[PDB]
Amino acid sequence: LKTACVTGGNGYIGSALIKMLLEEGYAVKTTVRNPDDMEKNSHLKGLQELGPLTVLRADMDEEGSLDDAVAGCDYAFLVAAPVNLWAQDPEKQQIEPSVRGTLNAVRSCVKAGTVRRVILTSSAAGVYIRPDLQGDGHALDEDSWSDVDFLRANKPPTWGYCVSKVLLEKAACRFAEEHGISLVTVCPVLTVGAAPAPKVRTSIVDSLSMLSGDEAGLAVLRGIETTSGALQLVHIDDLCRAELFLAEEAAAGGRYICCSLNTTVVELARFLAHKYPQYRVKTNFDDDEHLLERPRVIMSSEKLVREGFEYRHNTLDEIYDNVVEYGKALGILPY
Amino acid sequence: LKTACVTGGNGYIGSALIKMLLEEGYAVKTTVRNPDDMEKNSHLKGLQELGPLTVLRADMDEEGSLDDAVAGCDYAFLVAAPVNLWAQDPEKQQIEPSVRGTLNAVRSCVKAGTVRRVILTSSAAGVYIRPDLQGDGHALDEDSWSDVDFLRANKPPTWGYCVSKVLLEKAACRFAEEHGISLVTVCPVLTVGAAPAPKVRTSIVDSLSMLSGDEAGLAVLRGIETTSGALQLVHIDDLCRAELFLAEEAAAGGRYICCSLNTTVVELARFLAHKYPQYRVKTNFDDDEHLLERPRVIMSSEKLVREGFEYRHNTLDEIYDNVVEYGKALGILPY
Numbered sequence: 001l002k003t004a005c006v007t008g009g010n011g012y013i014g015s016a017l018i019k020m021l022l023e024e025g026y027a028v029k030t031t032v033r034n035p036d037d038m039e040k041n042s043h044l045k046g047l048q049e050l051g052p053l054t055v056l057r058a059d060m061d062e063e064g065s066l067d068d069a070v071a072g073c074d075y076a077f078l079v080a081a082p083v084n085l086w087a088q089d090p091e092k093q094q095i096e097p098s099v100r101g102t103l104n105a106v107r108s109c110v111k112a113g114t115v116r117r118v119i120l121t122s123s124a125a126g127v128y129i130r131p132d133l134q135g136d137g138h139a140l141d142e143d144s145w146s147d148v149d150f151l152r153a154n155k156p157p158t159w160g161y162c163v164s165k166v167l168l169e170k171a172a173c174r175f176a177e178e179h180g181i182s183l184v185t186v187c188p189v190l191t192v193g194a195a196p197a198p199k200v201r202t203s204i205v206d207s208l209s210m211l212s213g214d215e216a217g218l219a220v221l222r223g224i225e226t227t228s229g230a231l232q233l234v235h236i237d238d239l240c241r242a243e244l245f246l247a248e249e250a251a252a253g254g255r256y257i258c259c260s261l262n263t264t265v266v267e268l269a270r271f272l273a274h275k276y277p278q279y280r281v282k283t284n285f286d287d288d289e290h291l292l293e294r295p296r297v298i299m300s301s302e303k304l305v306r307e308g309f310e311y312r313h314n315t316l317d318e319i320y321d322n323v324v325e326y327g328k329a330l331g332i333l334p335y
Numbered sequence: 336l337k338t339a340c341v342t343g344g345n346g347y348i349g350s351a352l353i354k355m356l357l358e359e360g361y362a363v364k365t366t367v368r369n370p371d372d373m374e375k376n377s378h379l380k381g382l383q384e385l386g387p388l389t390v391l392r393a394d395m396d397e398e399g400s401l402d403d404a405v406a407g408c409d410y411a412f413l414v415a416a417p418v419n420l421w422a423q424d425p426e427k428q429q430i431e432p433s434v435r436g437t438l439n440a441v442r443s444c445v446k447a448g449t450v451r452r453v454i455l456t457s458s459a460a461g462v463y464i465r466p467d468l469q470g471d472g473h474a475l476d477e478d479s480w481s482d483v484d485f486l487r488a489n490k491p492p493t494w495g496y497c498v499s500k501v502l503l504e505k506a507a508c509r510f511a512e513e514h515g516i517s518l519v520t521v522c523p524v525l526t527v528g529a530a531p532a533p534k535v536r537t538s539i540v541d542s543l544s545m546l547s548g549d550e551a552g553l554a555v556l557r558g559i560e561t562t563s564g565a566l567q568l569v570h571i572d573d574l575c576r577a578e579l580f581l582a583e584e585a586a587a588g589g590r591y592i593c594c595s596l597n598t599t600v601v602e603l604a605r606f607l608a609h610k611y612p613q614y615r616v617k618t619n620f621d622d623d624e625h626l627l628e629r630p631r632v633i634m635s636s637e638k639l640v641r642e643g644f645e646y647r648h649n650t651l652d653e654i655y656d657n658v659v660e661y662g663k664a665l666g667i668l669p670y
């Protein structure tokens with residue numbers, strides 16, 4: 001069989017990727033940091049009783065820890081990454097560990113000799129910090145990079161996360177090219193949908209905040225719109241198929257935005273209020289709230305599409321098709 | 336004042352639209368075919384003594400008939416249309432007059448020069464004839480068009496009505512684009528609620544059939560579900576507000592489904608049986624329970640809700656809040 005490595009099998013996106021790879025007939029090796037924690041990793045046993053899944057222990061911050069897991073793999077999906085969006089000391093707790101851990105992982109992939117392609121999962125946060133674009137009508141593509149200097153000078157919330165994505169991508173791209181290994185980078189927007197992982201929180205807390213009523217989650221969604229010009233969404237299923245697509249399509253190369261739809265907080269609030277009447281969805285925003293009626297800047301996925309990929313969740317109704325039941329199971333929603 | 340034209344002021348939806356436009360401060364001009372029939376048109380005098388309403392005589396089948404009425408209007412609400420759902424000769428009694436009357440109306444709107452936007456009332460019957468979708472889990476949006484080929488090949492009941500909506504929509508859009516006039520099309524599902532018109536019947540006969548026991552109306556409801564995959568409902572007041580919203584919302588464009596709730600014959604029957612025990616509502620079926628237990632195909636109003644519209648009647652109780660009294664006043668219900 002063809003074998004794939006997925007770092008961070010207990011993560012939100014990582015757990016979904018593993019499930020899809022197995023379904024598509026791959027043998028899968030995944031790393032977690034504490035396999036003995038079956039609260040976090042029970043889905044890996046569930047999947048492991050269904051398909052050829054291997055679970056290993058590794059911390060990406062330790063050089064060479066990934067050597068064994070990626071040995072004998074055709075593809076390496078580097079999903080695991082530091083996600084301290086709000087660290088007190090971002091340079092040391094988010095940025096430096098991100099760059100160092102990504103280089104550690106690519107080094108292991110090179111060492112393995114068998115890895116045909118590395119698939120690095122980054123984020124739209126490395127793309128859409130663009131304070132030089134004013135007014136509306138803007139459309140960002142893979143040539144757009146988040147303004148690191150602006151981020152370090154002004155340090156808005158989650159600035160360290162945005163910087164870490166920019167720096168780790170460039171470090172990864174340089175390392176891969178200097179060692180002759182093919183590297184594809186995927187920059188997904190906010191990802192929504194059910195996954196096998198039983199104890200994840202991550203962005204689900206935020207994407208469900210209009211239904212849960214959590215004001216911190218609501219601030220995150222507002223922050224995305226304010227800082228990037230829109231609220232961009234993609235379904236977990238489309239993200240995982242996109243990663244498989246980019247791994248398999250030999251003609252694929254370089255960076256790829258993964259984004260199905262550009263909306264706004266107000267649009268999403270209205271739609272969710274309409275689709276889920278049982279929740280008290282606040283839709284009446286009033287003035288000061290610098291909220292957009294329509295996107296000012298959109299993220300373009302034309303490169304991935306013209307590459308041959310097709311999204312299957314193309315409306316708000318389809319992007320939010322199964323996340324509510326997932327939120328219930330995770331305890332993020334009560335009922 | 337801003338001035339709006341409404342065709343067919345004696346019609347069910349037309350009469351409700353006129354009352355709402357007058358309430359919202361519009362000067363209104365409406366056309367009827369026989370203003371001297373004050374049994375059908377008395378509500379227009381009642382409205383005329385309360386607000387700035389002009390009543391004119393016109394038959395949409397005759398080219399130019401609408402010229403005078405729509406002259407000086409900022410918006411034109413084309414509500415009047417042939418409703419011979421069961422014509423013996425649909426081609427000549429339903430389809431051709433529909434296309435021709437709509438083109439006549441839009442031509443008059445262009446000639447007026449003042450019409451900023453045309454709001455064309457069409458029907459969900461132009462959307463949900465989709466024999467290619469089997470199983471459940473389907474959601475239809477504005478890109479779904481009723482299958483005219485299937486309709487002409489099998490000629491199910493009301494096939495001529497369904498075809499007329501598809502053709503008049505496409506002909507109208509091609510004409511509007513060539514003349515650079517904004518045309519927005521609304522495709523309501525089964526519309527329910529009280530209206531000023533005193534002698535209308537239309538779908539009220541069918542939407543009240545579970546209370547009246549009329550088996551022809553009950554057959555129409557079962558037919559909607561069997562042919563479209565659900566029993567879709569919207570309140571007259573939400574439809575009228577939606578039409579105003581789309582007229583006034585500069586960003587709005589193209590076609591819009593108007594649908595508050597996707598339910599079933601059985602669920603509606605159980606709801607009506609509990610709400611109105613004085614009437615004898617049949618809730619026990621079987622075999623004939625080819626009736627769905629839950630919608631197989633749902634009409635998605637996501638485009639309209641994203642545009643900025645919010646439904647105010649969202650439950651069966653809210654959708655059926657005042658239709659029964661109206662049915663009494665119309666003689667459709669005895670008591």
Ligand SMILES: NC(=O)c1ccc[n+]([C@@H]2O[C@H](COP(=O)([O-])OP(=O)(O)OC[C@H]3O[C@@H](n4cnc5c(N)ncnc54)[C@H](OP(=O)(O)O)[C@@H]3O)[C@@H](O)[C@H]2O)c1
Pocket residue numbers: 007008009010011012013014032033034058059060061079080081082083101121122123124187188189190191192200201202203204
């Ligand atoms: N969720 C979204 O909506 C979204 C959208 C766009 C981009 N992204 C990005 O895609 C990546 C995955 O996101 P996610 O939502 O799945 O986050 P998550 O649920 O919190 O999972 C993060 C994974 O990374 C692991 N990890 C972190 N540091 C590690 C380390 N030093 N060594 C080994 N493993 C480490 C974590 O393992 P531990 O449990 O041991 O910490 C976990 O498995 C993230 O980089 C995210 O920023 C997410």
Ligand SMILES: NC(=O)c1ccc[n+]([C@@H]2O[C@H](COP(=O)([O-])OP(=O)(O)OC[C@H]3O[C@@H](n4cnc5c(N)ncnc54)[C@H](OP(=O)(O)O)[C@@H]3O)[C@@H](O)[C@H]2O)c1
Pocket residue numbers: 342343344345346347348349367368369393394395396414415416417418436456457458459522523524525526527535536537538539
């Ligand atoms: N009622 C619903 O539940 C529903 C749901 C979805 C869509 N719709 C569609 O919305 C439209 C209005 O529906 P409705 O319930 O209000 O029907 P309605 O009560 O029977 O009224 C029909 C109106 O159209 C007029 N009309 C027909 N042909 C005309 C012509 N050649 N020239 C001038 N006027 C003409 C009629 O005037 P006359 O009296 O002189 O014939 C009448 O005013 C219809 O196209 C319907 O198919 C209705």
Ligand SMILES: O=C1C[C@@H](c2ccc(O)cc2)Oc2cc(O)cc(O)c21
Pocket residue numbers: 083085123124125188189190201202203205206220224232
């Ligand atoms: O790691 C991520 C991804 C990030 C994100 C949001 C929007 C976007 O467009 C790209 C990335 O959002 C989050 C929000 C959280 O509460 C926790 C998280 O771990 C994350």
Ligand SMILES: O=C1C[C@@H](c2ccc(O)cc2)Oc2cc(O)cc(O)c21
Pocket residue numbers: 418420458459460523524525526537538539540541555559567
């Ligand atoms: O003109 C219409 C609208 C049509 C309709 C029903 C459901 C739907 O979803 C869309 C349209 O139903 C009707 C039923 C009638 O007895 C008489 C009518 O004149 C009509």
